[PDB]
Design an enzyme around this catalytic site. Structure first.
Site, PDB file in Angstrom:
ATOM      1  N   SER A  77       0.843  -1.189   0.000  1.00 47.73           N
ATOM      2  CA  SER A  77       0.000   0.000   0.000  1.00 47.73           C
ATOM      3  C   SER A  77       0.879   1.240   0.000  1.00 47.73           C
ATOM      4  CB  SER A  77      -0.932   0.019   1.219  1.00 47.73           C
ATOM      5  OG  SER A  77      -1.845   1.108   1.148  1.00 47.73           O
ATOM      6  N   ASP A 131       1.558   5.280  -6.689  1.00 44.22           N
ATOM      7  CA  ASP A 131       0.540   6.244  -6.275  1.00 44.22           C
ATOM      8  C   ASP A 131       1.209   7.133  -5.232  1.00 44.22           C
ATOM      9  OD1 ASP A 131      -2.944   6.048  -5.283  1.00 44.22           O
ATOM     10  OD2 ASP A 131      -1.499   7.624  -4.872  1.00 44.22           O
TER      11      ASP A 131
END
Ligand SMILES: NC(=O)c1ccc[n+]([C@@H]2O[C@H](COP(=O)([O-])OP(=O)(O)OC[C@H]3O[C@@H](n4cnc5c(N)ncnc54)[C@H](O)[C@@H]3O)[C@@H](O)[C@H]2O)c1
Ligand SMILES: Nc1ncnc2c1ncn2[C@@H]1O[C@H](CO)[C@@H](O)[C@H]1O
Length: 467
Positions: A77, A131
């Site tokens: 993540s 990201d």
């Protein structure tokens, strides 16, 4: 040959996560279309893919789309609070390496990033889904540290940079020259978000960018959908689950009126809030005026505002000085980037301010005069840290861009630089999502296409058209 490797909070959540993934698949026609078009030929067959992107249910559908089209994938993540542990467990249970859990420490966060990058001894990714640019940063900084080892003793007081330096010191002691070995094999990175794309253009301007990059944020079917209508959904969800606060009649301040701020202000207004916008750009400010919002500075609002949402990608938006002067129980949250839009570090180090936990990711900061502020998710992304992020349908648009970017980086020739996907592909992403909505597109006649000067099959707009 293939070793199972993962690190997640709780594998007993896998069945629940798998059910939610199955629901999300039926909301993501763009990703399913990618599986149907590319699943047999497998253009990414065997290609090593590192992903650093919020380990949500929606991201799970992206991972298994990249896997369906051939990818050899490792995931982490990009945010310490955004992982949905049941989605991570479901991905791990389907035998994809994932290193992610809600509530990582910063040390754990960077260690997971390294686990997702390292495919094996002196082996890294050939493609990167990123990201915010942290995985890209780790690779660029490790590469630089081989040439300039003194940067690993320079954190400039920033604790997180100290953590990164300590990790890179260890990596390069264990595998000297790791990054100069693996960087030539990286075909490119596809970058999800405004802040990460800003980092890419900065590196390209300085000539330090090491491999090709696709700016996925600036696909029209990403920036003008995800950033706006994803936030219109998920800001409200984050506020609801964290605080259950009624927005109607409350004075809510949105800092920044780019794509994120626009969607946030529309969400708040639809729930009856009195919306105030702050801006440094007079054009975005004038847009906020035309939409009926009040445009003020944060200082103007301190005596009356009930909720503050930072949406800038900038730092020092909500300062300790601001929070000292706020109404009691003012809610403060960040939907932009990192954790420095709000001065959380100042809150935590100010001797007279007492931190009192209310519930997970909801913390009261009590000031000596008796007033408090409520901080959400320690100042990190509130939609993902206090709720579930954007819903699947709009993430299907963003992630179809990601999938097409990955294929293109692998199959097409790019020089080092930052690129956007062609308009015809952008238009195709939109087409893939119209049927689910029941929309019926009009087809130009030959005479009409000639009259406005386009091919009947697109692209339909000049390259700098702003939509
Ligand atoms: N949480 C989410 O799900 C989500 C979704 C998409 C993007 N993002 C992030 O949100 C941030 C903003 O994204 P965007 O696409 O809207 O970018 P943007 O550039 O379109 O808009 C940001 C706006 O902030 C304004 N701004 C900058 N400094 C300011 C200041 N001191 N005070 C007030 N306004 C100021 C700028 O003028 C600009 O208009 C980025 O960090 C991006 O990566 C988050
Ligand atoms: N449910 C979600 N799943 C994965 N990524 C998301 C989700 N919601 C928002 N994001 C992404 O997080 C980025 C900010 O880090 C945004 O650009 C957006 O694309």
């Amino acid at each position: 040959t293939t070793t199972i490797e993962y690190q997640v909070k709780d594998m007993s959540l896998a069945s629940l996560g798998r059910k939610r993934i199955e629901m999300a698949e039926k909301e993501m026609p763009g990703l399913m279309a990618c599986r149907a078009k590319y699943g047999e030929e497998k253009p990414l067959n065997g290609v090593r893919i590192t992903g650093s992107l919020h380990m949500t249910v929606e991201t799970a559908v992206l991972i298994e789309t990249l896997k369906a089209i051939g990818g050899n994938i490792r995931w982490c993540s990009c945010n310490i609070f955004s992982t949905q542990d049941d989605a991570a467990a479901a991905i791990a249970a389907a035998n994809t390496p994932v290193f992610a859990w809600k509530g990582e420490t910063l040390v754990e966060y960077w260690e997971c990033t390294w686990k997702a990058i390292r495919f094996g001894p002196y082996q890294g990714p050939q493609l990167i889904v990123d990201d915010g640019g942290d995985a890209t940063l780790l690779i660029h900084r490790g590469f630089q540290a081989e040439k300039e080892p003194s940067i690993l003793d320079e954190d400039g007081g920033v604790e997180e940079l100290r953590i990164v330096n300590n990790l890179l010191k260890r990596i390069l002691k264990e595998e000297p020259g790791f990054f100069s070995k693996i960087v030539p094999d990286i075909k490119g990175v596809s970058e999800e978000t405004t802040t990460g794309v800003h980092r890419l253009y900065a590196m390209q301007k300085q000539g330090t960018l090491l491999f090709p990059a696709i700016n996925v944020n600036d696909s029209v079917t990403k920036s003008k959908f995800d950033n706006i209508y994803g936030c219109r959904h998920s800001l409200l969800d984050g506020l609801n689950r964290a605080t259950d606060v009624m927005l109607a009649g409350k004075e809510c301040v949105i800092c920044g009126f780019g794509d994120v701020g626009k969607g946030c202000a529309e969400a708040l207004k639809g729930q009856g809030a009195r919306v105030i916008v702050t801006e440094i750009d007079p054009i975005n400010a004038l847009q906020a005026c035309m939409a009926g919002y009040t445009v003020k500075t944060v200082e103007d609002c301190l005596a009356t505002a009930d909720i503050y949402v930072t949406a800038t990608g900038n730092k020092d938006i909500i300062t300790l000085d601001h929070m000292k002067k706020m109404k009691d129980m003012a809610i403060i949250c960040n939907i932009g980037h990192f954790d420095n839009e709000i001065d959380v570090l100042g809150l935590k180090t100010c001797e007279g301010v007492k931190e009192i936990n209310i519930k997970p990711q909801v913390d009261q900061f009590l000031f000596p005069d008796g007033h408090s502020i409520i901080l959400l998710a320690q100042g990190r992304l509130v939609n993902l840290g206090c709720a579930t992020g954007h819903p699947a349908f709009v993430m299907s648009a963003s992630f179809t861009n990601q999938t097409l970017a990955q294929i293109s980086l692998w199959k097409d020739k790019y020089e080092i630089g930052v690129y956007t996907l062609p308009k015809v592909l952008d238009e195709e992403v939109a087409r893939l999502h119209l049927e689910k909505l029941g929309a019926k597109l009009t087809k130009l006649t030959t005479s009409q296409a000639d009259y406005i000067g386009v091919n009947a099959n697109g692209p339909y707009k000049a390259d700098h058209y702003r939509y």
